[PDB]
Amino acid sequence: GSRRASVGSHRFKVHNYMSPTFCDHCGSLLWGLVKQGLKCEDCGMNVHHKCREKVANLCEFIVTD
């Protein structure tokens, strides 16, 4: 038995956060009221622009569809 996972690399896109949100890499607040960071279009990971280069490219999530 195996879960079905979607497995690729992150697809980060600049994102406008509507509530205070923290960087999933470093834990600091994503500062500002607009374009505060990047959100992975596939797995939802939120990062600072500066942290984009610090995270592993590996992007996986369980497909519960």
Tell me which of Zn ion, its own copies, none is bound by residue 23, counting a contact when its beta carbon lies within the kind-specific cut-off of 5 to 8 angstroms: Zn ion
What's the one-letter identity of residue 21? T
Strands (E), 1-65: 5-9, 12-15, 37-40, 46-47, 58-62
Contacting Zn ion within 4-63 (CB under 5 A)? 10, 23, 25-26, 40, 42-43, 45, 48, 51, 59
Residue 30 or 45 having the CB closest to its own copies:
45
Q: Contacts with Zn ion: how many residues (CB under 5 A)? A: 11
Question: CA separation (Å) from 3 to 7, 30, 45, 60?
Answer: 12, 32, 20, 12
Interacting residues with its own copies (CB under 8 A):
1-9, 42, 57, 59, 63
